Curated annotation (Swiss-Prot), chains A, B:
Cleavable signal peptide: none
Lineage: Bacteria, Pseudomonadati, Pseudomonadota, Betaproteobacteria, Burkholderiales
Entry protein name: 3-alpha-hydroxysteroid dehydrogenase/carbonyl reductase
Protein species of origin: Comamonas testosteroni (Pseudomonas testosteroni)
CDD domains in alphabetical order: 3alpha_HSD_SDR_c
Keyword flag Cytoplasm: yes
Underlying gene: hsdA
């Protein structure tokens, strides 16, 4: 009776989030290339469109939540997919699911960005304009024609653009009565002295999807053991 | 058994937090001008020194947590007190209590800053250097001689410096095994367009003080119903 849609549910944080939310009594409709109710490859427009239709077909009466965990990191073989999945795989889905979310009970959504979103300024983001304008081919070309790196550009650039996109939707989602927040997993040795377990990302998402976070909206919760605080003490 | 020290426990968020953590089974050692185990006024150096001594005497075996909710808003008659309580009332206590927290079980601390902490850049904060240097008289003089909007300066200035102070302690606190984060209040039912109840701040603090936030350290969690996102979409 309480459906929550989760992209990237097959592995990592997405898988760990499915576990915690199911323990809370939610019915999950997952989206991924495998081990998911909705099989889809979010790297292309056609793939996302079909995914959206497949999900909405199962949520004609609405959904209570949405968690977008699909994502590709640097080193990804084809860099164009990093931009497509990380940005459009999130933005097109959250935008298409808002109507359904609006009908839900205490509706909320969480988007997995990255601390890398703070490694660049949006106005200095080579992908910013293209991504905001919905120019996917252009954005993919940029990273595929990137200099030495390219991977960090596609990753940091897409995540930075993603966080800003979520914050720019705060007003509209607030009017619709749906909370929308992001978490930013870390990406040397953190002050807390260890690497995180996906479960530690999922527990924060569970908090953000619950009434305990009733007044939390449009925020980005950094989960990195303290690295960001050490690197950017004066920036928040 | 499990002691949690809470400053500003008599009213508002401090009171709401005390209720939630007490329900969680914690023994609370409150610090406030009234209705507290430790009666103290944190506006003076001697007052804080005495409060620290009185608290440590009750936590000889350590403490499991610390929540600093003491604070004064703009428009407080004597602006010097805003700086003293908001900054030193927090920094001297957390620094003095670290040894005790270090001895605790899954120790964590939460400091209540404000969304106002982001309304001024640390490098452009007229109180920054004085506060960091521990020059209380100098800092108080700055706001009491500011004239127009000296109240906003005292408030935004102390809170900005506070959030930076907490972030610069991330490395040391992490090495000590104690998590340290801030919440940034702004001012069921959708949050946008309404004020929050103190309980909605306390529920986030409860989360930050629990294992669910095991990898959250040095972070500032904004709890404002989305206002900050609307105002600063590209800053986070």
């Amino acid at each position: 009776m309480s459906i929550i849609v989760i992209s990237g549910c097959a592995t990592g944080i997405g898988a760990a989030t499915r576990k915690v939310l199911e323990a809370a009594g939610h019915q999950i409709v997952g989206i991924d290339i495998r081990d998911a109710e909705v099989i889809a490859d979010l790297s292309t427009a056609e793939g996302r469109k079909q995914a959206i239709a497949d999900v909405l077909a199962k949520c004609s009466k609405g959904m209570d939540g949405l968690v977008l965990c699909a994502g590709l990191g640097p080193q990804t073989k084809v860099l164009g997919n990093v931009v497509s999945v990380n940005y459009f795989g999130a933005t097109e889905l959250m935008d298409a699911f808002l109507p359904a979310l609006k009908k839900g009970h205490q509706p909320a959504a969480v988007v997995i960005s990255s601390v890398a979103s703070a490694h660049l300024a949006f106005d200095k983001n080579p992908l910013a304009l293209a991504l905001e304008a919905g120019e996917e081919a252009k954005a993919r070309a940029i990273v595929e024609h990137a200099g030495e790196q390219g991977g960090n550009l596609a990753y940091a650039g897409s995540k930075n653009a993603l966080t800003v996109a979520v914050r720019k939707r705060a007003a509209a989602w607030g009017e619709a009565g749906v909370r929308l927040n992001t978490i930013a997993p870390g990406a040397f040795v953190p002050p807390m002295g260890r690497r995180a377990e996906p479960s530690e990302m999922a527990s924060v998402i569970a908090f953000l999807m619950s009434p305990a976070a009733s007044y939390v909206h449009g925020a980005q919760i950094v989960i990195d053991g303290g690295i960001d605080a050490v690197m950017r003490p004066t920036q928040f």
